[PDB]
UniProtKB/Swiss-Prot annotation, chain A:
Topology term for the membrane: Lipid-anchor
Motif (Switch 2): 57-73
GO molecular function, a single term: phosphatidylinositol-4,5-bisphosphate binding
Protein name: Ras-related protein Rab-35
The protein's required cofactors: Mg(2+)
Result after altering residue 55 to A: Loss of interaction with ACAP2 and RUSC2
Gene that encodes it: RAB35
UniProtKB/Swiss-Prot annotation, chain B:
Organism in which the protein naturally occurs: Homo sapiens
Summary of the tissues where the protein is detected: Highly expressed in dendritic and natural killer cells and at lower levels in other myeloid lineage cells and in pituitary. Significantly up-regulated in effector memory T-cells as compared with naive T-cells.
Known role: Guanine nucleotide exchange factor (GEF) for RAB35 that acts as a regulator of T-cell receptor (TCR) internalization in TH2 cells. Acts by promoting the exchange of GDP to GTP, converting inactive GDP-bound RAB35 into its active GTP-bound form. Plays a role in clathrin-mediated endocytosis. Controls cytokine production in TH2 lymphocytes by controlling the rate of TCR internalization and routing to endosomes: acts by mediating clathrin-mediated endocytosis of TCR via its interaction with the adapter protein complex 2 (AP-2) and GEF activity.
Top-level division of the source organism's lineage: Eukaryota
dDENN domain ranges (all copies): 277-343
Residues annotated as domain cDENN: 139-275
Name of this chain's protein: DENN domain-containing protein 1B
Subcellular location: Cytoplasm, Cytosol; Cytoplasmic vesicle, Clathrin-coated vesicle
uDENN domain residues: 14-138
Length: 169, 343
């Protein structure tokens, strides 16, 4: 490998993080065994070999706010909400505020998952887009079920992290 | 929100297994029709969370308690009795943190098996299994009654108790190592309990089995136990900055100086009490740590919590500490839990 990067995926249980982790992985969870899981994705961006490892932990929904200690050592975060659950979004705003205030060096993107059932959707696109806009971050709406916009989303965080690293060099 | 124990589990325990060391073999389980295949695959590996090939014969007869964390981050306690020689292990899986009871029950099940008393065993299992979880006999841990604190305290130098405490209070990535699973899990459970009324909120694995060693590379805070026969493999991995305590020798290595960040008056009061003969019996040890917690976080008394009023102390050492304390997930869940109940 040429580069290694470490990602976190955060969000309420029931937002599809594990389905997203399945799409992420090269291969084919321990989340209900040791409360933690990691997946490995390898990708080539402009000839360069990159290995991404992403980490999830159990029961994150009980954290009103995920504090700065959680993010040490991490290059990038995928903050996931569920477009059919308004509470998953509110939490995600708190987390991205704490990130903005205490960890602005970390790349993060916002992700609205389960963009699959129109009849059940509650977080409107312009709302999330407006919040995304004011945090200076990019937003993706995805379906881990149908596999829609997921690759686009992963390639974004991957590119962000690769550029932060070269813009630091 | 605060504690990592399931309040009202469905059952007194969920599974009992006799396992022997290809994977370990389940010889016998109750209930016979236990249906969660994910638990049936993982539990046997946690029964023998060491390099069996290399150190089986060094294993002494012992009791230890693994933990599996569920989807809600609640703890499933794996109470195990491992026979000398480390080839055979008896295991009760429960949400109830009943260490002393289940250790005794494991010995009684072992004696029923050796005396070939099958009915009495099935009766006892049945009756306790279908018994509604009893809330009455029908408080701070004390030494020697509570086995996790007692074994922690006898195995680990006072200085290292203080170091692990400080490291927890900076939500470090902590690995504890021992050649004894009894001591190992005991150190993890006993050290964590001394946070009371706060609880460790992140990765919590009292003993980590060989197939899961790569999890020591986690970037997030953690408290993880590793048997000594696996430490070389772990070290050869590419770890983040981690705090390691090898209980076999009471050797601590950490690139941080977290204990230096705690106010000296608190540390010397805690230290002086821990070294006092009489502290070594009854609730002295837990009370000492309880009192340290009070001195460090007690000023939180001051409905909402004002971070800037809490962080404003006169002494530079304490102000500095309080400014890091507000970033602790363990402190955050405690405050938020207390703001929830105050209504």
């Amino acid at each position: 490998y040429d580069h290694l990067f470490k990602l976190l995926i955060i969000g309420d249980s029931g937002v599809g993080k594990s389905s997203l982790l399945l799409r992420f992985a090269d291969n084919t969870s321990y989340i209900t065994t040791i409360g933690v899981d990691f997946k490995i994705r390898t990708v080539e961006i402009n000839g360069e070999k990159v290995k991404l490892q992403i980490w999830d932990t159990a029961g994150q929904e009980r954290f009103r706010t995920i504090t700065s200690t959680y993010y040490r050592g991490t290059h990038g975060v995928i903050v996931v909400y569920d477009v059919t659950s308004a509470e998953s979004f509110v939490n995600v705003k708190r987390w991205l505020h704490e990130i903005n205030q205490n960890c602005d060096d970390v790349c993060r993107i916002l992700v609205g998952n389960k963009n699959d059932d129109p009849e059940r959707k509650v977080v409107e696109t312009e709302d999330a887009y407006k919040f995304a806009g004011q945090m200076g971050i990019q937003l993706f709406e995805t379906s881990a079920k149908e596999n829609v916009n997921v690759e686009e989303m992963f390639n974004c965080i991957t590119e962000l992290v690769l550029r932060a690293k070269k813009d630091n060099l | 929100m605060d504690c990592r124990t399931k309040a009202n589990p469905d059952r007194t325990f969920d599974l009992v297994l006799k396992v022997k060391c290809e994977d370990p073999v389940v010889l016998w389980k109750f209930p016979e029709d236990f249906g969660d295949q994910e638990i049936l695959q993982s539990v046997p590996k946690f029964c023998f969370p060491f390099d069996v090939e290399r150190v089986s014969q060094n294993q002494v007869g012992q009791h230890f308690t693994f933990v599996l964390t569920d989807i809600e981050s609640k703890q499933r306690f794996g109470f195990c009795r491992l026979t000398s020689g480390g080839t055979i292990c008896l295991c009760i899986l429960s949400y109830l943190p009943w260490f002393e009871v289940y250790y005794k029950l494991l010995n009684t099940l072992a004696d029923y098996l050796a005396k070939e008393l099958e009915n009495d065993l099935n009766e006892t299992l049945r009756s306790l299994y279908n018994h509604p979880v009893p809330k009455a006999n029908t408080g701070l841990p004390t030494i020697p009654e509570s086995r996790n604190l007692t074994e922690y305290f006898v195995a680990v130098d006072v200085n290292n108790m203080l170091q692990l405490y400080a490291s927890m209070l900076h939500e470090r990535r902590i690995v504890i190592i021992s050649s004894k699973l009894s001591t190992l899990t005991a150190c993890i459970h006993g050290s964590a309990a001394l946070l009371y009324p706060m609880y460790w909120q992140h990765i919590y694995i009292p003993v980590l089995p060989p197939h899961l060693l790569d999890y020591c590379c986690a970037p997030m805070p953690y408290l993880i136990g590793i048997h000594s026969s696996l430490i070389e493999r772990v070290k050869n991995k590419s770890l983040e900055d981690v705090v390691m305590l090898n209980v076999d020798t009471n050797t601590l290595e950490s690139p941080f100086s977290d204990l230096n960040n705690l106010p000296s008056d608190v540390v010397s009061a805690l230290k002086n009490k821990l070294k006092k003969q009489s502290t070594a019996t009854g609730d002295g040890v837990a009370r000492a740590f309880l009192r340290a917690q009070a001195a460090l976080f007690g000023s939180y008394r001051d409905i909402t919590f004002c971070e800037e009023s809490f962080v404003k102390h006169r002494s530079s050492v304490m102000k500095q500490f309080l400014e890091t304390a507000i970033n602790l997930q363990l402190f955050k869940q405690f405050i938020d839990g207390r703001l929830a109940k105050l209504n």
